[PDB]
Write an enzyme that holds these catalytic residues in place. Structure first.
Site, mmCIF file in Angstrom:
data_model
loop_
_atom_site.group_PDB
_atom_site.id
_atom_site.type_symbol
_atom_site.label_atom_id
_atom_site.label_comp_id
_atom_site.label_asym_id
_atom_site.label_seq_id
_atom_site.Cartn_x
_atom_site.Cartn_y
_atom_site.Cartn_z
ATOM 1 N N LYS A 40 36.065 3.127 -44.090
ATOM 2 C CA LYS A 40 35.441 4.204 -43.334
ATOM 3 C C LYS A 40 36.469 5.240 -42.880
ATOM 4 O O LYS A 40 37.548 4.897 -42.410
ATOM 5 C CB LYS A 40 34.710 3.638 -42.110
ATOM 6 N N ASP A 130 23.328 3.065 -31.161
ATOM 7 C CA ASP A 130 22.848 3.520 -32.460
ATOM 8 C C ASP A 130 22.186 2.402 -33.258
ATOM 9 O O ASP A 130 22.286 2.368 -34.464
ATOM 10 C CB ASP A 130 24.030 4.100 -33.237
HETATM 11 C C1 LIG Z 1 26.076 -2.718 -50.867
HETATM 12 N N1 LIG Z 1 27.162 -2.694 -49.887
HETATM 13 C C2 LIG Z 1 27.150 -1.749 -48.935
HETATM 14 O O1 LIG Z 1 26.466 -0.761 -49.066
HETATM 15 C C3 LIG Z 1 27.996 -2.017 -47.775
HETATM 16 C C4 LIG Z 1 28.822 -3.216 -47.742
HETATM 17 N N2 LIG Z 1 29.604 -3.458 -46.652
HETATM 18 C C5 LIG Z 1 29.633 -2.588 -45.580
HETATM 19 N N3 LIG Z 1 30.413 -2.970 -44.547
HETATM 20 C C6 LIG Z 1 28.846 -1.319 -45.493
HETATM 21 C C7 LIG Z 1 28.834 -0.423 -44.519
HETATM 22 C C8 LIG Z 1 27.928 0.577 -44.946
HETATM 23 C C9 LIG Z 1 27.626 1.801 -44.150
HETATM 24 C C10 LIG Z 1 26.770 2.844 -44.731
HETATM 25 C C11 LIG Z 1 26.375 3.947 -43.937
HETATM 26 C C12 LIG Z 1 26.840 4.017 -42.536
HETATM 27 N N4 LIG Z 1 26.379 4.990 -41.697
HETATM 28 C C13 LIG Z 1 25.045 5.631 -41.938
HETATM 29 C C14 LIG Z 1 24.201 5.409 -40.719
HETATM 30 O O2 LIG Z 1 24.928 5.890 -39.607
HETATM 31 C C15 LIG Z 1 26.174 5.159 -39.353
HETATM 32 C C16 LIG Z 1 27.097 5.465 -40.518
HETATM 33 C C17 LIG Z 1 27.720 2.985 -41.971
HETATM 34 C C18 LIG Z 1 28.114 1.887 -42.761
HETATM 35 S S1 LIG Z 1 27.267 0.216 -46.452
HETATM 36 C C19 LIG Z 1 28.034 -1.112 -46.651
#
Ligand SMILES: CNC(=O)c1cnc(N)c2cc(-c3ccc(N4CCOCC4)cc3)sc12
Length: 286
Positions: A40, A130
């Site tokens: 991130k 959130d």
């Molecule tokens: C298929 N694997 C994944 O997709 C996946 C795997 N491991 C993870 N740790 C994460 C974290 C994700 C993520 C995606 C959008 C936000 N946002 C949007 C909403 O507002 C907060 C910011 C935050 C975190 S996706 C993902």
């Protein structure tokens, strides 16, 4: 720490608030034997946002719980937060794509895990601010985790609430009335949002049934822009609320409505929510 040069980009995972999360392979031996991780970073680095991000990173690593995404490290040159990669992605996308595989019993299992993760947050006086299914990640079919803490704040020692108004757009349709009118955030406002999360889960993320779509329909799609919040405030003031999702058991909807109490102090605790949900789970089992 994690070295910049050994982090290989694979794909974009999401974009929120002011960040982006990417899927990367940390391959320090450049021998494709390295693990995939989630990275991130701020989509537009500002000193104000960098200070917030630094705080966010401290918040996340101070958290160690089965239902909270794992902190792995940071990457320095443009600060980057390295977290564990949850293969099934967000609960919102997972549920929408897998509704035939996910029944009500599993929705309550996820619900229970979210509550325990939130009770753990409250034990450190952290206010998420959130909570929504898009911020919940799926490790496997039986395990979900709260996966983002970009708006999380620590309560001051002398107050049971925290005031804050950030520039940009807020998830107003997940916000408690006192968060819309007074910018007040507390465990109780997290509980209100948890009610919306519960609503989300039982709608199985049907596009027309989303909180934004439902409230805009009640407010009137012929609405303005700056007045949208004003009308939302009034609707909640007159006890207008999200409808009972199709197929949702009456006892589950009551948990929802109780979380959506205008009286901040009348909302249930996360501990109590877990107990009521686990009780309903057991009654649905045997
Ligand atoms: C298929 N694997 C994944 O997709 C996946 C795997 N491991 C993870 N740790 C994460 C974290 C994700 C993520 C995606 C959008 C936000 N946002 C949007 C909403 O507002 C907060 C910011 C935050 C975190 S996706 C993902």
């Amino acid at each position: 720490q994690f070295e910049e040069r050994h982090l290989k980009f694979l794909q974009q995972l999401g974009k929120g608030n002011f960040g982006s999360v990417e899927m990367c392979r940390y391959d320090p031996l450049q021998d494709n034997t390295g693990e995939v991780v989630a990275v991130k970073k701020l989509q537009h680095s500002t000193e104000e946002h960098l200070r917030d991000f630094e705080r966010e990173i401290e918040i996340l690593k101070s958290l160690q719980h089965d239902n909270i995404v794992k902190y792995k490290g940071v990457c320095y040159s443009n600060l980057k937060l390295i977290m564990e990669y949850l293969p099934y992605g967000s609960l919102r996308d997972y549920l929408q794509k897998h509704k035939e595989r996910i029944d009500h019993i599993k929705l309550l299992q996820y619900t229970s895990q979210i509550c325990k993760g939130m009770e753990y947050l409250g034990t450190k006086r952290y206010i998420h601010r959130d909570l929504a299914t898009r911020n919940i990640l799926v490790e496997n079919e039986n395990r979900v985790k709260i996966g983002d803490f970009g708006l999380t704040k620590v309560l001051p020692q002398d107050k049971e609430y925290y005031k804050v108004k950030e520039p940009g757009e807020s998830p107003i349709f997940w916000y408690a009335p006192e968060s819309l009118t007074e910018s007040k955030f507390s465990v109780a406002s997290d509980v209100w949002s948890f009610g919306v999360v519960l609503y989300e889960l039982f709608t199985y993320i049907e596009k027309s049934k989303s909180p934004p779509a439902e409230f805009m329909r009640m407010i009137g799609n012929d609405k303005q822009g700056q007045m949208i919040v004003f009308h939302l405030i009034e609707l909640l003031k007159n006890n207008g609320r999200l409808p009972r999702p199709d197929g949702c058991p009456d006892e589950i909807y009551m948990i929802m409505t109780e979380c959506w109490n205008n009286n901040v102090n009348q909302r249930p605790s996360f501990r109590d929510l877990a107990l009521r949900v686990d009780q309903i789970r057991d009654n649905m089992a045997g």
